[PDB]
Enzyme design. Structure first.
Site, PDB file in Angstrom:
ATOM      1  N   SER A 195       0.834  -1.201   0.000  1.00 35.85           N
ATOM      2  CA  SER A 195       0.000   0.000   0.000  1.00 35.85           C
ATOM      3  C   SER A 195       0.878   1.264   0.000  1.00 35.85           C
ATOM      4  O   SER A 195       1.600   1.488  -0.979  1.00 35.85           O
ATOM      5  CB  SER A 195      -0.994  -0.085   1.166  1.00 35.85           C
ATOM      6  OG  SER A 195      -1.539   1.161   1.532  1.00 35.85           O
ATOM      7  N   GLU A 322      -9.584  -4.906  -2.792  1.00 37.25           N
ATOM      8  CA  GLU A 322      -8.835  -3.791  -2.207  1.00 37.25           C
ATOM      9  C   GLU A 322      -9.732  -2.759  -1.532  1.00 37.25           C
ATOM     10  O   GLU A 322      -9.351  -2.157  -0.513  1.00 37.25           O
ATOM     11  CB  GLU A 322      -8.025  -3.100  -3.294  1.00 37.25           C
ATOM     12  CG  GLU A 322      -7.034  -3.992  -3.977  1.00 37.25           C
ATOM     13  CD  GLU A 322      -5.787  -4.205  -3.137  1.00 37.25           C
ATOM     14  OE1 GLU A 322      -5.775  -3.810  -1.947  1.00 37.25           O
ATOM     15  OE2 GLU A 322      -4.816  -4.758  -3.680  1.00 37.25           O
ATOM     16  N   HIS A 435      -7.696  -5.526   1.435  1.00 38.36           N
ATOM     17  CA  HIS A 435      -6.449  -4.768   1.456  1.00 38.36           C
ATOM     18  C   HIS A 435      -5.563  -5.155   2.640  1.00 38.36           C
ATOM     19  O   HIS A 435      -5.982  -5.082   3.801  1.00 38.36           O
ATOM     20  CB  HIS A 435      -6.791  -3.285   1.528  1.00 38.36           C
ATOM     21  CG  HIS A 435      -5.630  -2.378   1.311  1.00 38.36           C
ATOM     22  ND1 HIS A 435      -4.993  -2.271   0.095  1.00 38.36           N
ATOM     23  CD2 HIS A 435      -5.029  -1.484   2.132  1.00 38.36           C
ATOM     24  CE1 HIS A 435      -4.036  -1.363   0.180  1.00 38.36           C
ATOM     25  NE2 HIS A 435      -4.042  -0.864   1.401  1.00 38.36           N
TER      26      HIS A 435
END
Ligand SMILES: *[C@@H]1O[C@H](CO[C@@H]2O[C@@H](C)[C@@H](O)[C@@H](O)[C@@H]2O)[C@@H](O[C@@H]2O[C@H](CO)[C@@H](O)[C@H](O)[C@H]2NC(C)=O)[C@H](O)[C@H]1NC(C)=O
Ligand SMILES: *[C@@H]1O[C@H](CO[C@@H]2O[C@@H](C)[C@@H](O)[C@@H](O)[C@@H]2O)[C@@H](O[C@@H]2O[C@H](CO)[C@@H](O)[C@H](O)[C@H]2NC(C)=O)[C@H](O)[C@H]1NC(C)=O
Ligand SMILES: *[C@@H]1O[C@H](CO[C@@H]2O[C@@H](C)[C@@H](O)[C@@H](O)[C@@H]2O)[C@@H](O[C@@H]2O[C@H](CO)[C@@H](O)[C@H](O)[C@H]2NC(C)=O)[C@H](O)[C@H]1NC(C)=O
Ligand SMILES: O=C(Nc1ccccc1)O[C@H]1CCC[N@H+](C2Cc3ccccc3C2)C1
Ligand SMILES: *[C@@H]1O[C@H](CO[C@@H]2O[C@@H](C)[C@@H](O)[C@@H](O)[C@@H]2O)[C@@H](O)[C@H](O)[C@H]1NC(C)=O
Ligand SMILES: *[C@@H]1O[C@H](CO)[C@@H](O)[C@H](O)[C@H]1NC(C)=O
Ligand SMILES: *[C@@H]1O[C@H](CO)[C@@H](O)[C@H](O)[C@H]1NC(C)=O
Length: 526
Positions: A195, A322, A435
């Site tokens: 990320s 995500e 995520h």
């Protein structure tokens, strides 16, 4: 148990892992504590010490706001710092295999957390499994986040911006000067991150001051061209000044604003970071990377577009869901504790939460592209559409675009699509393959047969670990022994990618092609 580094000696500790041994060096400092006069400035070099530095426990995490939205809930609290917060947080960790390797490939982890949160001491970043199983050396560092890490007065060395990136960079530099003493090869260094960490890794591909500090790069669920990843010089200034007035530090001199901000307590700076933007989103990055003219010499979309980056192999990928994690941090009708079947007007309201400064026509365009259903009587239709909107816009489409454009300059690229939902995953099933929930598979936690993963998960983690280490060591993420699918290179025409899952691992093409044409060509115009 003692290693002589260029600034002094460090004592490590022995770990028993899978009937073997790993040597952990936890909490080695790599910079002068950025305190007092040094707050907001670039990290400064660490002067020699004469004793044995006891590197036997994780050091302080950097100051940061905690996610308090679900107290007592492991799904959120697993990401909160598991270590004392302090401004004195510039430390790194080293895991080396036992016995001491001779010329080991080095993996350097950069954690994410929106550039406002995160810490290398998290359980899911534990590098001992990789060192044991693949005999790589794992390095991870703490870097400054939030305003303490990315407050920008462009040009002004009192607050030039990108300090957290420079924290990372000094850590990479430390591996260059010192890792051989631990048995690592400074010429075989792979950055990997997730990320905001992934976006950090991609910006090191762009920064000339890092080009000699690493070999290869792995980008999990992030890249600098993501809409959340780079703060403009306009909004950085507006945010720096709103922080100033919010603390009584408004001045005219600018450098005297920094001097004023330096005498506030860490807490007062943290409490006010939330409000420097009028309308935040669950993906807000109040204080992030900027074009400082030092780490980052130009707007990164230009550098990417025009081939200005380190030429080398990259490994890039994303997770199937995500966007879902962000939905229960603000979107109406959503909850981790029910199945969040939302209506059309809730969806429409959700887009206003995720796209606040976007025209009514822009929000209608998003609704139009994502709501012509394969079957318009499913009650989940709007619930899944909003998660896909957030995921495609913020993660999947920018990663695909980064990989297309990076590979257009002749380097091998490998793209994965992670689609296994963890058996132990605390969030509800409607959130899917969330995520950040490939990370534990990358770090080999399912290899630990004690803590509850299915045997299929052990096998998947074992192959990913091999593929990651083969990519670090040799530039090629194959698993050559067990009769595994070959991972083809990603070329801008075929756009082949590899799916990772416990059942059938398959070669596919043109991930989310329809959605990404909307986001990457049309939508940047609205
Ligand atoms: C840094 O560590 C040394 C040694 O660490 C301890 O000893 C190792 C063998 C291991 O068992 C670790 O888990 C231990 O924590 C410290 O040394 C000792 O210092 C104390 C001082 O109170 C002394 O009484 C002991 O005799 C020393 N040796 C042992 C074996 O305990 C040293 O103090 C540490 N330095 C700092 C600054 O904390
Ligand atoms: C640039 O900053 C101005 C100043 O903002 C505000 O003050 C901060 C300390 C913080 O508390 C913010 O939440 C404030 O909004 C922004 O201006 C304001 O805009 C909001 C709504 O957009 C309005 O309600 C306020 O009255 C405005 N205040 C002033 C002084 O103009 C401005 O929106 C920022 N620029 C952008 C593009 O967002
Ligand atoms: C799913 O839950 C949301 C959240 O409401 C909260 O959490 C629930 C688990 C329960 O404990 C409620 O008491 C909480 O308020 C629901 O959203 C609420 O919906 C009502 C009616 O539609 C509305 O008046 C509230 O404004 C909503 N609150 C928020 C924060 O959005 C939602 O309706 C639930 N959906 C399903 C299908 O159960
Ligand atoms: O990271 C962020 N912003 C952010 C992340 C990625 C891109 C842009 C911005 O903020 C932290 C703190 C507030 C709560 N959020 C949520 C989002 C998320 C995603 C996966 C797992 C847990 C959580 C908690 C994490
Ligand atoms: C260690 O190895 C050095 C050469 O490194 C190699 O090339 C890089 C690109 C990696 O892919 C790595 O796998 C290779 O080993 C030598 O120059 C150096 O002298 C060696 N030193 C020791 C102590 O072995
Ligand atoms: C701003 O303050 C700094 C710090 O004392 C000083 O060096 C500088 O000359 C000042 N500049 C202006 C324009 O006032
Ligand atoms: C290959 O399969 C064997 C099964 O006996 C397993 O022990 C081994 O770890 C596997 N290797 C990889 C790289 O997946």
């Amino acid at each position: 148990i003692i290693i002589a580094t260029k600034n002094g000696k460090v004592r490590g500790m022995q770990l028993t892992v899978f009937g073997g041994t790993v040597t952990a060096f936890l909490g080695i400092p790599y910079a002068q504590p950025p305190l007092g006069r040094l707050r907001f400035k670039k990290p400064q070099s660490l002067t020699k010490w004469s004793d044995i530095w006891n590197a036997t426990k994780y050091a302080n995490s950097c100051c940061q706001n905690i996610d308090q939205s679900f107290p007592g809930f492991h799904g959120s609290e697993m990401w909160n710092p598991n270590t004392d917060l302090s401004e004195d947080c510039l430390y790194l960790n080293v895991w080396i295999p036992a016995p001491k390797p001779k010329n080991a490939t080095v993996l350097i982890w950069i954690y994410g957390g929106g550039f406002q949160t995160g810490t290398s001491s998290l359980h899911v970043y534990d590098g001992k499994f990789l060192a044991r199983v693949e005999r790589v050396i794992v390095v991870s560092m703490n870097y400054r986040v939030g305003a303490l890490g990315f407050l920008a007065l462009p040009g002004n060395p009192e607050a030039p911006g990108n300090m957290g990136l420079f924290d990372q960079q000094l850590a990479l530099q430390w591996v260059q000067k010192n890792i051989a003493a631990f048995g690592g090869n400074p010429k075989s260094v792979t950055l990997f991150g997730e990320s905001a960490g992934a976006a950090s890794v991609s910006l090191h591909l762009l920064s000339p001051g890092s080009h000699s500090l690493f070999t290869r790069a792995i980008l999990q669920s992030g890249s600098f061209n993501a809409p959340w990843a780079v703060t403009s010089l306009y909004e950085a200034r507006n945010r720096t000044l709103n922080l100033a007035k919010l603390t009584g530090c408004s001045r005219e001199n600018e450098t005297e604003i920094i001097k004023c901000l330096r005498n506030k307590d860490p807490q007062e700076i943290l409490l006010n970071e939330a409000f420097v933007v009028p309308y935040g989103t669950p993906l807000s990055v109040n204080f992030g990377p900027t074009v400082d003219g030092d780490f980052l010499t130009d707007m990164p979309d230009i550098l990417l577009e025009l081939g200005q980056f380190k030429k080398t192999q990259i490994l890039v990928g994303v997770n199937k869901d995500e966007g879902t994690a962000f939905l229960v941090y603000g979107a109406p009708g959503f909850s981790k504790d029910n199945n969040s079947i939302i209506t059309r007007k809730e969806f429409q309201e959700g887009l206003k939460i995720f796209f606040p400064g976007v025209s009514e026509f822009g929000k209608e365009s998003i609704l139009f592209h994502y709501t012509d259903w394969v079957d318009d009587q499913r009650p989940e239709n709007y619930r899944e559409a909003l998660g896909d909107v957030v995921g495609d816009y913020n993660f999947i489409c920018p990663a695909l675009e980064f990989t297309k454009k990076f590979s257009e300059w002749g380097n091998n690229a490998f793209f994965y699509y992670f689609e296994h939902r963890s058996s132990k995953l605390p969030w509800p099933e409607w959130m899917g393959v969330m995520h950040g929930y490939e990370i534990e598979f990358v770090f080999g936690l399912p290899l630990e047969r004690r803590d509850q993963y299915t045997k299929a998960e052990e096998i998947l983690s074992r192959s990913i670990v091999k593929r990651w280490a083969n990519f670090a060591k040799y530039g090629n993420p194959q698993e050559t022994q067990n009769q595994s699918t070959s991972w083809p290179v990603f070329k801008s025409t075929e756009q082949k990618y590899l799916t990772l899952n416990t059942e059938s691992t398959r070669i596919m093409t043109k991930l989310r092609a329809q959605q990404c044409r909307f986001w990457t060509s049309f939508f940047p115009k609205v």
